[PDB]
Amino acid sequence: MGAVAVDLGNRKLEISSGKLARFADGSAVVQSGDTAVMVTAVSKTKPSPSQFMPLVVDYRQKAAAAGRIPTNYLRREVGTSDKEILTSRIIDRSIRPLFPAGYFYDTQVLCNLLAVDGVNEPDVLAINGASVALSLSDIPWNGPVGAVRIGIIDGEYVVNPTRKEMSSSTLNLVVAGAPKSQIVMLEASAENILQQDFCHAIKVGVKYTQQIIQGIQQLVKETGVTKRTPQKLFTPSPEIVKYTHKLAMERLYAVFTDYEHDKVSRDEAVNKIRLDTEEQLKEKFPEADPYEIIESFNVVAKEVFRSIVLNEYKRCDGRDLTSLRNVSCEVDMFKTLHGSALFQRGQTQVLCTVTFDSLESGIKSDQVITAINGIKDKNFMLHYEFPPYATNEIGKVTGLNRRELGHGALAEKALYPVIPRDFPFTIRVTSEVLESNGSSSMASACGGSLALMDSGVPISSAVAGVAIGLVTKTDPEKGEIEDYRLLTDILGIEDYNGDMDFKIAGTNKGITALQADIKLPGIPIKIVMEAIQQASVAKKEILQIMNKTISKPRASRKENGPVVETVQVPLSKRAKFVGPGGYNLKKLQAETGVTISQVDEETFSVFAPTPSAMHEARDFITEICKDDQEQQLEFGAVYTATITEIRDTGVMVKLYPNMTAVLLHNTQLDQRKIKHPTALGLEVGQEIQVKYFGRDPADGRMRLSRKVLQ
Amino acid sequence: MGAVAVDLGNRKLEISSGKLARFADGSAVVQSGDTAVMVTAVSKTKPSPSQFMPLVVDYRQKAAAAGRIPTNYLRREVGTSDKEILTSRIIDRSIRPLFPAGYFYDTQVLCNLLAVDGVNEPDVLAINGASVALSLSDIPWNGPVGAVRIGIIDGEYVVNPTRKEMSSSTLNLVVAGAPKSQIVMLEASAENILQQDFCHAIKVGVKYTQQIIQGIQQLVKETGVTKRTPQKLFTPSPEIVKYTHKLAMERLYAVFTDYEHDKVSRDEAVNKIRLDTEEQLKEKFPEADPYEIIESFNVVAKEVFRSIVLNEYKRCDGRDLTSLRNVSCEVDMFKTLHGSALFQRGQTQVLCTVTFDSLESGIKSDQVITAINGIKDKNFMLHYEFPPYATNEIGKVTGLNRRELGHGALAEKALYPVIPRDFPFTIRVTSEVLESNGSSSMASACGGSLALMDSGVPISSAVAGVAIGLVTKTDPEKGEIEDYRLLTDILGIEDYNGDMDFKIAGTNKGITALQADIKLPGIPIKIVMEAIQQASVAKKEILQIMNKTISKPRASRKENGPVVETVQVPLSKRAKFVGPGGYNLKKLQAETGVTISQVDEETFSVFAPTPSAMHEARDFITEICKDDQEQQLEFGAVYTATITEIRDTGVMVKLYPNMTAVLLHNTQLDQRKIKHPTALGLEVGQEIQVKYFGRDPADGRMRLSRKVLQ
């Protein structure tokens, strides 16, 4: 019966195991305040066919546990929202780099929200729960890993803040801690804070994770758990590696020193050398599995590449540790898009598109996530597309691709703190990747900054994104870090052989978004601190060059942009204009793309993406308001009025046959105070000459006064 | 093209062959009244790569043939409704147990609604059609089978009642019969009716199936079809089986005689013996297919397990036939849930949660599902969840698993007859299975009864579910049942090697739901009658245990429960409160989760899950109704209203130059009812004393009275 209390200042954490889902390999329950999340870990005992661990993590969100039914067509949990996916990816990046190398077995980690009390967000709890569940099962691991969330309010750092605090916080930082104060996963989003606060926040965050790790350590000792031995680890034998090293080290060395090689040329040289070595290895060791052969070659290839970096301080093209790839920019690419930007760094090419839209499209039907977390007060959202042809590949473009969604959210957080609070249109920014060579997401963010900057939206200041690469010479005995080198403007091949990915973006003043994908089993703070410092210098550089293309936003939005118009519609015409069940409005909306909303009984807001569409809508409404032929607005003209209804306070008379009758009151019927029109000898259907005094919008009745004629 | 008519009391059944889709192996058309259903059957001649029944049954609902249309964007029949899935599962469980053993060939049975009128029903027709279609094709089969539906109205049984009568009828039972009056499929729902009536309904139902099965025999004899010979049946050779029996019976008998093994320990010991035996088989028989070896071991395993049951009347755990596993219950797990229940039976553990919701979430836009089944009268629906980790298994978390849907419907039918007629909230009951060891569905139903019972919804009485298992000593020549034993509270291992599953749930007095998944090719009615009788005793026993944990619903709902309020929004601010297209209301709904409905022009219904959330909504709406400079002024006050315009029907005035120009009618201007404002010396911009008589909403005009001052 696991039972451990952990104290984090004003917050208490309850960790319990057993009594729930005892059939699974590892089951844990994490309770904070009144919200509790239970996590299960299942690992197969059969070597799955693959060259990698098939780790799959899901974070299902129970809407019913929050007191709401999902707004799906089936009133039930169907599909997964982005928020779940982002949370899952956070968990995946948080725990993956702790498994022993070569462990290739199916492993599913599932998170369930037992109950959400609406006072404590559960995402941070889930990460800790997985760590508890894993460390409490037989599955081999090197954890446990502690996770906290740090927010800043009024210059005060608060761990695990409540919903109200997030909305009021300028910084949302998630820190994942490993033993001996090692950071394993970093993720943050800030309203453009300075660097110094970021330094202090991290130092606090790891400090708290140390406490949480002690409790889990205490819990494991109390319960007692034996780690099952896997059937067979898939690491290559040293002999195959060493033979591989003696067979390709010089050729690979030559390949990686060719500063003129592009992405493609380098791979082909790498690939062809791979073939020759693979044949020779098969000759020497036919008994060896192909998986081992392929793995061995990669290890040797990875090893030498890193060695070159550690020694000669030249990555692949003579570039130093701080130099950047060539950067190109282009704006106003087409004459139609409201905002266009062509951003190309080195070989990576990214296209960003800015498109305005009506405020009606910004409805967030997903209530539970917006209730628990909140809504982006700025009507802003981003699309990130990674077509397969961007990497000379084959596949299907899916909007639910986890890698695609994760990158997009990172860009969205990057650009968020610069959108002005108030704007008469939703800003839907679409970024498309055309040629990918690493660090696409930051490049996507930069281009979006450019396209928006051209679109005329008065943003605060330009936003720059840059990735950071690292290589460490590891000491095999203790696993500590011997030496390390930091890379700026990382290349794709650098990432693959690299140890960790550091995506940080912000503005000239401070930092907005940060995401660190690490693969080592932990890194000390000092390395991270230098990385931020190094990234800042390049950030200033990349902003400096980008500013030459454009410096200030356009004084006005580009022509052919969206237009907003308001139209007066008389109530009599309203039924005609709307049509039965509003079908006419839908048809007009479907046909010309013009979005029309009813401001009130007489006025209708009309949105048109183009003035041409505005003209089409203006014509259509003019036609609809023309069949309801309301005569000219005259104050002294006398028109025949058809007495439709004989009331007691007056006569409902239709001055024109194209609209309903109005209260020709007894005070508007005769100069004497009549109180029944029957005293005037008025019959139904009789035409009475009533002077037209225009229309009175106060009561919706056109001003008719028969008293001036009688 | 064979044709035949079958008389069922007041209803006629027409079955025709040929004339339609002659290309398929088996094509049949079933016509009742004016509803006709076509059933097709296809069976590939090549042995399937699978190692079991690759049977797939689908039943599509063409809304066009029912005078309706689907409510999807594409207007097509995109996706499958639950009702379709339940119908398909009914058919599958109705024909599967008649295929010859080992027939491993792809087979798909499709159902189409040629035309659906407003009287008869397609489901019962579909089952009969499949039986006709199979028996008319060259697919090996031991059919045909007959399916009828029995309803009870005014204590009178009616076969195949019209959909107009389902709502009136207190019972809805489906019976599928085999030759020699053998039941195959049993599916029933009822309103807590007595056991005796259930007995009579079954006796009648099988009796009618004897007629319908008789007719099909007439048709097939008339047409004279010949069943094709399969390439090869996949039953293991008797010789191999005998060797296994002589090699594994001793150890297997030892394993199952243990009374200490859990599920996990028992299976692995079985699995361990399986590995040893399988290896030795390969030694003896290298020619045999590996799958045959696997199948042979299972067969002798099954035979021994059933054998030991028959001879010693002791189940695999050390219980008796009537005894049941120990049961534990717990309520009120977390203070942030309107109702929680933890139900544990044996090793099966199930969690049930009760979540109230606003009535608006209960909309079910589906034309056909009401075009046939009928109307809804209890705003309540259950969600059943069977996550993979509940069985130490890795899978895909997805709510479209057929097994999940089938179990969920069974629970929903189980609890239906106890929900009150009316309730100010929808009742979404979510049950999650945490540890599965068989009979989870009834356990889920029981827990839902508990959680509901805790939630404070006043129900009729507690609901108990139990499963029944049967083992038969079969005569290999006749196929009749020489001997049989019944098992209460069946274990998963018992089920897998058992003969049939009997899920029946009811109250302390009667029976609500009954699903009988059977795998034998038919069982006599006397068998079922005993099973229900035995199940009745257990149901009382479970209720005896459950009553200790709770016996009556709470006096009221939980404090944090949902709240109801009505707000009087002034008409003047109504547009501002609503906004263009109700955008504010949509925004308000997404922010706090509080839903708003327009009771009328002045009253708005507000539904909140928590009083705290309501408090937030109340502040927001109060702010919206107060932030305006134009507020509800004090009644009866006199204001010096400036005249903005002089007209005929009255005078447009504003109390202070922030409000709008309001029409003070001539009847409201003077006691003698002057008819021109200039009669009082009024001018443009002149300030006049008028007493503020409140705001009566009839045309948007704010009330004033200058008549008293004259």
Q: Which two tokens stand for residue A149?
A: 């969330």
Cα-only R_g, chain A = 34
DSSP secondary structure, A74-91, as one string: TSS--S--HHHHHHHHHH
- Which of A27, A117, A663 is facing B336, going by the closest CB pair? A117
Angstroms from A498 CA to nearest CA on chain B: 31
Give how far A443 is from chain B: nearest CA, Å. 33
Q: CB distance A703–B647 less than 8 Å?
A: yes
Report which secondary-structure segment, H or E, holds A533.
Answer: helix A525-549
Tell me the CA end-to-end span of chain B in Å, nearest whole number.
96
Q: Are A220 and A136 in contact (CB under 8 A)?
A: yes
- CA dist A653 and A646 (Å) reads 9
> B115: which 2 tokens?
């035309």
Q: How far apart are CA A294 and CA B343, in angstroms?
A: 51
φ and ψ of A235, to 5 deg? -65, 140
Helix (H, G, I), strand (E, B) or coil at A514: strand
- In contact, A92 and A55? CB cutoff 8 Å: yes
Resolution (A): 3.8
What residue spans of B77-179 are helical by DSSP H? Answer: 82-95, 123-135, 163-166
User: Which chain B residues are Cβ-neighbours of A590 within 8 angstroms?
Assistant: none
Contacting residues of B for A426, CB less than 8 Å apart: none
- B684 secondary structure, DSSP code: T
Backbone angles phi, psi at A24, to 5 degrees: -70, 165
Rounded Cα gap, residues A27 and A42, in angstroms: 9
Cβ-based burial of A18 (10 A; exposed 0-12, middle 13-18, buried ≥19) = middle
CA–CA distance, A456 with A443 (Å, rounded to integer): 20
- On chain A, the residues whose CB falls within 8 A of the CB of B364 are 75
Asked if B538 and B546 count as a contact pair (C-beta separation under 8 A), the reply is no
Residues 6+ apart with CB under 8 A from A105: A43, A44, A45, A46, A47, A48, A53, A54, A230
- Joined together, the tokens standing for residue B128 give 């009969």
- Quote the tokens at residue A93: 């990046």
What is the H or E stretch that residue B577 is in? helix B571-578
Return d(Cα A380, Cα A375) in angstroms, integer. 10
B649 interaction partners in chain A (CB closer than 8 Å): 663, 665, 667-668, 696, 699, 701, 703, 705
Tokens representing A657?
Answer: 């046959």
Q: Which of A23, A121, A167 to mutate to test the interface with B (most CBs of B within 10 A)?
A: A23
Let me know: does B159 contact B11? Beta carbons within 8 Å. yes
Torsion angle, alpha carbons of A572, A576, A580, A584, to 10: -140
DSSP assignments along B171-183, one per residue:
EEEEEEEETTTEE
β-partners of residue A468 are A488, A502
Cα separations in angstroms, A49 against A23, A93, A105, B414: 25, 23, 9, 44
DSSP state of A260: T
The Cα–Cα gap between A644 and A652 comes to 6
Nearest Cα of chain A lies from the Cα of B436 at a distance, in angstroms, of 8
H or E stretch including A312? helix A290-312
Q: Which amino acid is at B640?
A: T
Q: Among the residues of A327-469, which ranges form H helices? A: 367-372, 402-415, 440-455
C-alpha span between A517 and A96 (Å, rounded):
10
What is the residue-wise DSSP string for A180-247?
TTEEEEEEEEEEEE-HHHHHHHHHHHHHHHHHHHHHHHHHHHHH---PPPPS---PPPHHHHHHHHHH
Three-class DSSP category at A449: helix
Residue A653: exposed, middle, or buried by beta-carbon count in 10 A (0-12, 13-18, 19+)? buried
Residue B195's contacts (CB-CB under 8 Å, 6 or more residues apart) are B510, B511, B532, B533, B536
Count Cβ atoms within 10 A of the Cβ of residue B644 and give its class: 0-12 exposed, 13-18 middle, 19 or more buried.
Answer: middle
Residue A39's closest CA among A100, A112, A137, A146? A112
Nearest CA in chain B to A674: B673
| Chain B contact for A699 (CB, 8 A cutoff) | yes
Q: Look up residue B689 and give its amino acid.
A: Q
Residue A357 C-alpha from the chain's centroid: 18
Residues 6+ apart with CB under 8 A from B516: B183, B185, B186, B187, B500, B501, B502, B503, B528
Residue ranges in A424-503 assigned as alpha helix (H): 440-455, 492-497
Disruptive mutation site among B389, B426, B601 for chain A (greatest number of A CBs within 10 Å): B389
Burial B303-333 (b: 16+ CB within 10 A, else e): bbbbebbeeeeebbbebeeeebbebebebbb
Nearest to B527 by CA among B30, B182, B140: B182
In B, which residues are within 8 Å of A42 by CB distance?
388-389, 392-394
Q: After which residues does chain A show a gap where C to N exceeds 2.5 Å?
A: none
Among residues 230-249 of chain A, which lie with CB inside 8 Å of chain B? none
Cα(A660)–Cα(A662) distance, integer angstroms:
7
Q: Taking Cα atoms as reference points, which of B209, B219, B213, B225 lies closest to residue B4?
A: B219
Side-chain-side CA neighbours of residue B526 (13 Å): 4
Please answer yes or no on whether A64 and B435 come within 8 Å at the CB atom. no
A261 backbone dihedrals φ, ψ, rounded to 5°: -70, 140
CA A430 vs CA A337, A353, A386, A399: distances in Å:
11, 5, 11, 13
What is the least distance, in Å, from the CA of A79 to any CA of chain B?
8
Q: Which amino acid is at A145?
A: V
Residues 406-435 of B with CB under 8 A from A: 426, 428, 430, 432, 434-435
Q: How many residues does chain A have?
A: 710
Q: Specify which residues B115 forms β-bridges with.
A: B36
**Which residues contact residue A620 at a Cβ distance below 8 angstroms, ignoring those fewer than 6 apart?**
A588, A592
Angle between helix A263-284 and helix A290-312 axes, rounded to 10 deg = 130
Extract the tokens encoding A690.
Answer: 């009533």
Partner-chain contact B389 A110, CB within 8 Å: yes
Burial call A534-571: b when 16+ CB within 10 Å, e when fewer: bbbebbebbbeebeebbeebbeebbeebbbebebebbe
- Give the helix/strand (H/E) hosting B328: strand B327-331
Report which DSSP code applies to B416.
G
Residue B47 tokens, joined: 């042995």
- According to DSSP, the β-strands at B146-153 and B156-159 are antiparallel
Interface contact flag, A707 B336, Cβ < 8 Å: no
Question: Is the previous residue joined to A144 through a cis bond, with omega within 30 degrees of 0?
Answer: yes
* R_g over Cα of chain B: 34
CB contact under 8 A, B648 and A700: no
Nearest of A519, A647, A510, A570 to residue A188 by alpha carbon = A510
Distance to chain A for B593, nearest Cα, Å: 6
Considering only CB atoms, B428 lies closest to which of A69, A78, A370, namely A69
Handedness of CA B325, B330, B334, B338 (dihedral sign): positive
Q: Is the dihedral of CA B679, B683, B686, B691 positive or negative?
A: positive
Neighbouring C-beta atoms of residue B204, cutoff 10 Å: 17
Closest chain B C-alpha to A42 CA, distance in angstroms: 6
Helix (H, G, I), strand (E, B) or coil at A452: helix
The answer to whether the Cβ–Cβ distance between B355 and A67 falls below 8 Å is: yes
Structure tokens at B676: 């021109």
Q: Do B362 and A60 count as a contact with CB atoms less than 8 A apart?
A: no
Count of residues making up chain B: 710
